[PDB]
Amino acid sequence: AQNPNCNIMIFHPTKEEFNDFDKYIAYMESQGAHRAGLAKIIPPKEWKARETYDNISEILIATPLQQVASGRAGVFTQYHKKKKAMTVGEYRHLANSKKYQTPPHQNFEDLERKYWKNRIYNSPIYGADISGSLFDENTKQWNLGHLGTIQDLLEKECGVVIEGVNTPYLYFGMWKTTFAWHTEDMDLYSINYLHLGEPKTWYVVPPEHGQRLERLARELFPGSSRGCGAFLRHKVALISPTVLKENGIPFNRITQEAGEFMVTFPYGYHAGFNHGFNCAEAINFATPRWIDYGKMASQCSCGEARVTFSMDAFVRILQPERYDLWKRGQD
Numbered sequence: 001a002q003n004p005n006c007n008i009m010i011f012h013p014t015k016e017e018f019n020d021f022d023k024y025i026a027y028m029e030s031q032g033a034h035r036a037g038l039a040k041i042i043p044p045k046e047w048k049a050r051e052t053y054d055n056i057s058e059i060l061i062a063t064p065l066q067q068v069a070s071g072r073a074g075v076f077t078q079y080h081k082k083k084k085a086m087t088v089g090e091y092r093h094l095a096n097s098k099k100y101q102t103p104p105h106q107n108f109e110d111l112e113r114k115y116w117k118n119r120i121y122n123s124p125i126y127g128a129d130i131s132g133s134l135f136d137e138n139t140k141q142w143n144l145g146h147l148g149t150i151q152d153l154l155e156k157e158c159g160v161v162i163e164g165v166n167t168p169y170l171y172f173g174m175w176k177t178t179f180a181w182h183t184e185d186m187d188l189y190s191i192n193y194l195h196l197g198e199p200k201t202w203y204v205v206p207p208e209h210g211q212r213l214e215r216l217a218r219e220l221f222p223g224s225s226r227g228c229g230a231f232l233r234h235k236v237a238l239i240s241p242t243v244l245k246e247n248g249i250p251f252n253r254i255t256q257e258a259g260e261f262m263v264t265f266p267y268g269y270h271a272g273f274n275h276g277f278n279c280a281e282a283i284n285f286a287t288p289r290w291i292d293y294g295k296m297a298s299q300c301s302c303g304e305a306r307v308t309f310s311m312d313a314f315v316r317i318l319q320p321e322r323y324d325l326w327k328r329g330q331d
């Protein structure tokens with residue numbers, strides 16, 4: 001079995017290997033990359049996402065989210081308070097202000113220590129989940145707006161044509177902006193490109209050990225667990241590496257820098273934080289190997305998780321027994 005310790009693998013495809021996206025994912029899996037739940041892909045030196053980032057300031061962040069924490073430094077939840085709209089240029093200036101900017105630090109490890117010590121005492125503002133793309137239309141390789149759609153994959157594998165679309169999302173971050181522990185909708189893959197700015201640190205639990213994380217989360221967030229049998233779908237809970245290590249939960253960590261891709265694999269729980277002002281683009285995708293994970297994915301039916309239009313068909317076709325209850329939670 002390849003990669004039996006479930007380490008995060010880093011790949012350096014050549015420009016020739018960068019042509020066929022599906023083929024390269026299957027290659028990474030042949031080497032055991034999926035066992036970690038997360039992989040890094042460094043694009044060939046010849047590749048670029050677009051020519052420059054000089055003209056992005058007028059993008060609108062319609063609903064910036066202030067991420068307010070509750071709990072203790074290593075075990076907390078966050079809620080999202082909606083703020084007034086602002087442009088990317090306005091948000092960049094805010095991120096660089098004395099109130100929100102990255103503190104002085106020695107290296108990524110020092111910054112990680114400072115994040116876990118101090119996150120809860122601040123409320124950073126995240127421009128998340130903005131439909132759109134920063135890939136140039138002429139970028140033919142690993143263009144996250146030109147991927148094969150999940151609806152087409154389901155149709156190719158299973159023969160059933162379904163409604164829905166699959167488009168990318170932009171994320172504008174600042175110091176301490178935080179992504180809570182989650183797997184993707186329907187335990188899909190994700191791919192994330194860091195277009196510009198400061199790094200993003202990731203934590204990930206191997207898919208084979210995801211239920212260990214779920215059991216700890218039920219212990220640590222006991223009211224939330226009584227409220228919903230899949231409350232991590234709410235995307236609000238954080239648990240630090242120190243707490244994971246104290247409770248014996250297998251995990252790994254890595255820092256993504258500008259110009260690098262990350263892939264999350266089906267049922268790979270992940271969480272993380274931004275180091276400073278940045279912009280990332282991410283989208284969900286599927287492969288043949290995902291289908292079995294989609295069929296087994298947990299679902300929130302309490303009403304909290306509320307997701308896209310396109311998830312309806314996935315539930316309806318892959319999980320017909322759950323459909324009625326889940327749809328009630330959507331309505």
Ligand SMILES: O=C(O)CNC(=O)C(=O)O
Nearest residue numbers: 171179190191192280282
């Ligand atoms: O970058 C972020 O805030 C969160 N991204 C992801 O969870 C992802 O790409 O799957």
Ligand SMILES: [Mg+2]
Nearest residue numbers: 056057058059
């Ligand atoms: Mg602009």
Ligand code: NI
Nearest residue numbers: 183184190264
């Ligand atoms: Ni994710």
Ligand SMILES: [Zn+2]
Nearest residue numbers: 228300302304
């Ligand atoms: Zn729920």
